[PDB]
Amino acid sequence: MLPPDILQNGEFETIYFQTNPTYIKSPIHIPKSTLGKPDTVKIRHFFALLHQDLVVLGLEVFVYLQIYSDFVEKYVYVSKCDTVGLEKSTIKIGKVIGPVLQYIINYNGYKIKMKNLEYRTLPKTQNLRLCVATKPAKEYLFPNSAKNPYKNLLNGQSLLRWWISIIDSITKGWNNHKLMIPGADKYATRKFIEKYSDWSEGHIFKKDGLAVQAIPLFPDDPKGRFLELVIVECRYGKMTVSRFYQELAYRQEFLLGDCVSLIGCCKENLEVTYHDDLVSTVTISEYKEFMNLLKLVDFSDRVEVSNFVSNYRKS
């Protein structure tokens, strides 16, 4: 999951666990009368890097498996990424996030129960979709870390360049790499990817038809929040994909935001081998319990951070 030059035989330690794979309703609306409706299985991944008894950084990723008869549409959604900054940075954050994210993308050892009505065997054909929204915020996972002396806080354009760099490095050879910056003109968007030959402006989803039938509604996502509104106001039947992205640009999050951007990459028709890889797996309740404990930690306070960490080690 990480190279030895980073871990350094115990100087650093990791927290990594997944939820047990859980069936959910599709994050992309599928009509009841649609040929070959797929089963959706969701897995939450949490990763943190530790240095002695302090947290250094964290990454939360959700994987969605849309399981059809002969293939899987696999969505990998970056939920949260953050640093603590209590100590002087000794590793470049990207050299950890990149490899961890690649690991999660390519992980294929899920223990999926049969759907009601042993374990399920997934199709070998997988189509990958990686989805990341870049939105500058002082804290995404570690409350009160913004005032920490060594937390390097990127502005929106810098954060975007950083994510493009990270994602490009772990999607080598993928079928597309899409950048959208809602509300920006094409030249402004093109500037960020002029040095990336495989990247183009736009998005990875179905271009036509109703937005709710094309765009996944992910938790705590800028598109997701707008999709939620479209659905609540029962406009799911009228709002097209093009109009959705047009109007998304005028949302307060975007129009008052700092270079808030949407990245998507695809890889089609990857044959994959199932491989069991023994990692810690927890119930969703255990996962939520951990995340709730996290949100009550003052990450400007070494005492509380050390306490949180040692308490996790106890389990």
Q: Does residue 175 contact residue 268 with C-beta atoms inside 8 Å?
A: yes
Q: Which residues contact 94 (CB under 8 A, 6 or more apart)?
A: 162, 165, 166
Q: 148 is written with which tokens?
A: 């920490």
E strands, 102-163, in order: 125-134
- CA dist list (Å): 311 to 184, 285, 290: 46, 17, 10
Distance CA 99, CA 49 (A): 12
DSSP 3-state of 301: coil
Q: Which residues contact 206 (CB under 8 A, 6 or more apart)?
A: 213, 214, 241
Q: How many Cα atoms sit within 13 Å of 38 on the Cβ side?
A: 21
Q: Which amino acid is at 102?
A: Q
For this PDB entry, the determination method is X-ray
Q: Strand 12-19 relative to strand 39-51: parallel, antiparallel, unpaired?
A: antiparallel
- CA dist list (Å): 279 to 115, 183, 253: 23, 42, 37
Give me the catalytic one of 208, 221, 276, 298: 221
First to last CA, the chain: 22
Distance CA 247, CA 297 (A): 37
Q: 219 is written with which tokens?
A: 């938790």
Q: Calculate ∠ Cα 140-144-150, nearest 5°.
A: 90
Q: Which residues of 244-283 are buried (b: 16+ CB within 10 A; e: fewer)?
A: bbebbeebeebeebbbbbbbbbbbeebeeeeeeeeeebbe
Residue 221 is a catalytic residue: yes
Task: Give the residue among 110, 107, 112, 114 at the shortest CA–CA distance from 128.
Answer: 107
